[PDB]
Design an enzyme around this catalytic site. Structure first.
Site, PDB file in Angstrom:
ATOM      1  N   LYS A  10       0.303   3.600  -2.834  1.00 41.25           N
ATOM      2  CA  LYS A  10      -0.831   4.522  -2.907  1.00 41.25           C
ATOM      3  C   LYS A  10      -0.330   5.959  -2.946  1.00 41.25           C
ATOM      4  O   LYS A  10      -0.977   6.794  -3.559  1.00 41.25           O
ATOM      5  CB  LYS A  10      -1.883   4.311  -1.797  1.00 41.25           C
ATOM      6  CG  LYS A  10      -2.567   2.936  -1.721  1.00 41.25           C
ATOM      7  CD  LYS A  10      -3.766   2.806  -0.752  1.00 41.25           C
ATOM      8  CE  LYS A  10      -4.368   1.402  -0.665  1.00 41.25           C
ATOM      9  NZ  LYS A  10      -3.688   0.419  -1.563  1.00 41.25           N
ATOM     10  N   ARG A  42       3.414  -1.687  13.700  1.00 41.32           N
ATOM     11  CA  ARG A  42       4.274  -0.923  12.801  1.00 41.32           C
ATOM     12  C   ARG A  42       4.412   0.494  13.355  1.00 41.32           C
ATOM     13  O   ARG A  42       5.518   1.049  13.461  1.00 41.32           O
ATOM     14  CB  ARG A  42       3.731  -0.916  11.371  1.00 41.32           C
ATOM     15  CG  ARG A  42       3.764  -2.286  10.717  1.00 41.32           C
ATOM     16  CD  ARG A  42       2.834  -2.335   9.509  1.00 41.32           C
ATOM     17  NE  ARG A  42       1.489  -1.888   9.861  1.00 41.32           N
ATOM     18  CZ  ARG A  42       0.490  -1.745   8.997  1.00 41.32           C
ATOM     19  NH1 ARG A  42       0.698  -2.009   7.709  1.00 41.32           N
ATOM     20  NH2 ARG A  42      -0.692  -1.326   9.433  1.00 41.32           N
ATOM     21  N   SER A  44      -6.393   2.813   3.614  1.00 38.38           N
ATOM     22  CA  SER A  44      -5.676   1.934   2.702  1.00 38.38           C
ATOM     23  C   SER A  44      -6.659   1.098   1.870  1.00 38.38           C
ATOM     24  O   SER A  44      -6.438  -0.098   1.656  1.00 38.38           O
ATOM     25  CB  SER A  44      -4.714   1.054   3.479  1.00 38.38           C
ATOM     26  OG  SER A  44      -3.585   0.720   2.689  1.00 38.38           O
ATOM     27  N   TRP A  97       1.028  -3.389   4.118  1.00 41.71           N
ATOM     28  CA  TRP A  97       1.040  -4.770   4.588  1.00 41.71           C
ATOM     29  C   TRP A  97       0.801  -5.664   3.384  1.00 41.71           C
ATOM     30  O   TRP A  97      -0.328  -5.741   2.885  1.00 41.71           O
ATOM     31  CB  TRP A  97      -0.032  -4.999   5.655  1.00 41.71           C
ATOM     32  CG  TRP A  97       0.067  -6.327   6.350  1.00 41.71           C
ATOM     33  CD1 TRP A  97       0.728  -7.463   5.933  1.00 41.71           C
ATOM     34  CD2 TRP A  97      -0.569  -6.665   7.595  1.00 41.71           C
ATOM     35  NE1 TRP A  97       0.532  -8.482   6.840  1.00 41.71           N
ATOM     36  CE2 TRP A  97      -0.241  -8.018   7.874  1.00 41.71           C
ATOM     37  CE3 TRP A  97      -1.359  -5.947   8.513  1.00 41.71           C
ATOM     38  CZ2 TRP A  97      -0.697  -8.664   9.030  1.00 41.71           C
ATOM     39  CZ3 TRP A  97      -1.792  -6.586   9.662  1.00 41.71           C
ATOM     40  CH2 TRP A  97      -1.464  -7.924   9.914  1.00 41.71           C
ATOM     41  N   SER A 110       0.808  -1.223   0.000  1.00 41.08           N
ATOM     42  CA  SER A 110       0.000   0.000   0.000  1.00 41.08           C
ATOM     43  C   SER A 110       0.840   1.272   0.000  1.00 41.08           C
ATOM     44  O   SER A 110       0.255   2.343  -0.074  1.00 41.08           O
ATOM     45  CB  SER A 110      -0.903   0.051   1.209  1.00 41.08           C
ATOM     46  OG  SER A 110      -1.950  -0.912   1.139  1.00 41.08           O
TER      47      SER A 110
END
Length: 244
Positions: free
Chosen positions: A53, A230, A97, A190, A50
């Site tokens: 993006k 994270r 996301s 992820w 992601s």
């Protein structure tokens, strides 16, 4: 003051305690610092998942495939996660996301212009292959944690080759935290398709006084793990270093 031996030990321990393997790269000015419990990940290639993006948005906005207030409607089909079953702007899709919205944007951009743009920006290995709507999940696009932190650095400083306004618009989508007069801008990632799975949080800290400190966390996600690991490792690391 705290020794660098102690900083290195503390940050390694954050990865050790999450039972993962990972690295966080920090950039101060031109200097790259690698920390964590698996330093050699720093120049290994992984799928961007992601994180892509951020660039998908830059390209779509620059090339007038969308505006920042346009609402992408949910088509009514079941989506992997229920929070994705709603109408949303690029900015809301960035925070959630929401891959379906970004897949729509990639399809508007089209394979040919996507290839040209990704090559033009020099992102990672720059190969997107033949499917405009899935190249960031399972190949062929790859990128190293060093390349990710350098991309963040470029975006944070408006140095990518897109209009300043495009860059500001995408940056406004990426604000995820405020912490003692510091703002954190980042995109998580992820990659659940690849084995092993890859986790990312790539962004920068904008400090009270205007200085921007880019970072990229890169770690192995495992079946047992929560996504917020994270964030936690990142915040603990930036705080240990007194960046936030």
């Amino acid at each position: 003051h705290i020794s660098s031996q102690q900083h290195e030990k503390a940050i390694k321990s954050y990865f050790d305690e999450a039972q993962t393997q990972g690295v966080i790269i920090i950039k101060e000015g031109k200097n790259l610092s690698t920390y964590g419990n698996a330093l050699a990940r720093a120049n290994k290639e992984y799928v961007p998942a992601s994180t892509f993006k951020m660039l998908n948005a830059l390209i779509g906005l620059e090339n007038h495939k969308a505006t920042t207030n346009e609402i992408f409607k949910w088509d009514g089909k079941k989506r992997t996660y229920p929070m994705w079953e709603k109408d949303m702007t690029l900015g809301e899709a960035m925070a959630l996301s929401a891959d379906p919205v970004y897949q729509e944007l990639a399809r508007r951009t089209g394979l040919e212009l996507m290839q040209k743009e990704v090559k033009r920006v020099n992102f990672g290995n720059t190969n997107i292959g033949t499917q405009v709507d899935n190249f960031w999940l399972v190949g062929p696009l790859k990128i190293t944690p060093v390349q990710e932190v350098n991309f963040a650095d470029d975006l944070a400083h408006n140095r990518l080759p897109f209009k300043l306004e495009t860059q500001e618009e995408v940056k406004k989508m990426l604000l995820i935290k405020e912490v003692n007069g510091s703002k954190i801008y980042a995109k998580s990632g992820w990659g659940m398709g690849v084995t092993p799975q890859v986790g990312w949080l790539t962004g920068w800290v904008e400090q009270a006084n205007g200085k921007k400190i880019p970072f990229s966390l890169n770690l192995e996600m495992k079946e047992g793990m929560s996504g917020s690991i994270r964030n936690e490792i990142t915040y603990k690391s930036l705080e240990n270093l007194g960046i936030i």
